[PDB]
């Protein structure tokens, strides 16, 4: 180490994007509408399975636990354009490592608007435990086959990366191979993950879902949610597995009044060229 | 009594908080590289290029499976974003997400890059930081950062209005599409997360979010990698400089080594994924 290692390590953090900077979201009007809804359908999404479901901008989704504690991956679409989808990297430059009420989830650039804002999570007390532990990840991708083999050789087909691409090219009728180059980096719903503290290392514990817990979106453009069972259950292995329910609800007319739906990006596009 | 709401801590919240972490992707499950085999050959080895380059630019190098590349600072303290393409199929990328849960937040000699799923394997291995003393410093931060995706023009756009073209991901896509011939908007869309070269960043421990600071990052530092496959790399030097901003930007050398004849032993260079990419079906 050079002889002023100490004063580098000692210069203070700067947060990227602060809190302050950020588009602030209309919570209350969310609330108010949510308030209004009614049930319009559901998805109950079977253990080591995937499923698609559609929310209409302006509605609202709601992920509950059931049965048992179980994590689940999610991926989200613009429903009118597929290659609109779920940003995990600048969700988590936003808000952090985790995600919570009152944050968005991004979409990819150049798109790069709200797709869905969090109005409600039961395991909001969560916090961030002792050992940098908290849930509803921004930093996994989805457990994959292609590690899978890496790592233990061999084939497993239900893992949340092939549960989601089954799901999606099931939905919409692309070519399997084709929805698996769509399928993105989830939001890992449920699930209790950090870094640990003296390596840096990606980790997971037992989830402290229970059934009853839910985590409700509100829908800012028109989505096509996939959603997957994960096959490490609650994440609590050193899987016993259980379903998953997504409710579709819808806001009486006008409770929304005047919003829009967010726009894309304006950003000329151009690079300077 | 007073009424719950459905946010509210369970009486058990300390009992679930203290559950203990299981680290996800042991060491002990990743493939060894042969850091040895890697290093004896780069010892042997000679020079065959460079590419300097400019502040606030983005530029492309080619590098062959077996070769060595090297980014070293120059003239000032500054930071580089790096993205990795498989030379003969640029669609095959690093992959900063699965990079990340194999490895860290931060990546250091011995780890590999990965690329994308289905190809997922190594695309180029560290050989040698000569930051590996910085370590986790009192706030979190390391150096050499899987979890940023890159500096870009439509959070800037979103975030502050206005149109800036020098951002990262601004700079490598021109130097993507000037090297390749591909149009621009075709070669914006493989462009991809980063690692962040030199960043000094971390999550804080208090609320999670995203930092930076100041690079320990002086001229003479390099990061230095061993080629596992055949490249097409792309580095921008970040408008941010050495991210010390509360920016006085610097060029960024990379430089191109090659082996001795038979340095390299029996090293395979890594074929593509073995799954067999049914999905069950
Ligand atoms: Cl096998
Ligand atoms: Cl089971
Ligand atoms: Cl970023
Ligand atoms: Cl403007
Ligand atoms: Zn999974
Ligand atoms: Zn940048």
């Known amino acids: 180490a050079p002889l002023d290692a100490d004063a580098r390590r000692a210069v203070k953090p700067v947060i990227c994007y602060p809190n302050d900077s950020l588009p602030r979201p209309d919570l209350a009007l969310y609330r108010a509408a949510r308030a209004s809804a009614r049930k319009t359908g559901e998805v109950l999404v079977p253990p080591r399975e995937g499923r698609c ?11 509950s636990s059931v049965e048992g504690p179980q994590v689940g991956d999610l991926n989200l679409h613009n429903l009118h354009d597929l290659t609109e989808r ?24 150049p798109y790069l608007r709200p797709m869905a804002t969090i109005i409600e999570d039961t395991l909001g007390w969560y916090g961030i435990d002792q050992y940098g532990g908290s849930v509803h990840d921004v930093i996994g991708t989805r457990c994959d086959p ?43 719903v449920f699930m209790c993950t950090g870094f640990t503290r003296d390596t840096g290392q990606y980790f997971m514990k037992a989830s402290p879902v229970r059934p009853g817990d839910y985590l409700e979106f509100f829908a800012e453009i028109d989505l096509l949610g996939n959603l997957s069972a994960c096959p490490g259950g609650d994440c609590s292995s050193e899987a016993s597995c259980h379903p998953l329910l997504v409710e579709i609800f ?20 151009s690079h300077g060229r």
């Open 53 to 63: 479901f559609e929310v209409k901008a302006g509605q609202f989704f709601r992920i």
């Open 86 to 109: 779920f940003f995990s990297g600048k969700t988590r430059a936003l808000h952090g490592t985790h995600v919570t009420t009152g944050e968005r989830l991004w979409s990819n650039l």
């Open 146 to 188: 292609y590690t899978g083999n890496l790592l233990a050789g061999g084939h497993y087909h239900h893992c949340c990366h092939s549960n989601l691409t089954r799901a999606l090219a099931d939905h919409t009728g692309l070519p399997l191979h084709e929805a698996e180059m769509l399928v993105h980096d989830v939001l890992n």
């Open 250 to 269: 819808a806001p009486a007319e006008g409770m929304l009044g005047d919003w829009p739906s967010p726009s894309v990006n304006g950003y000329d596009r």
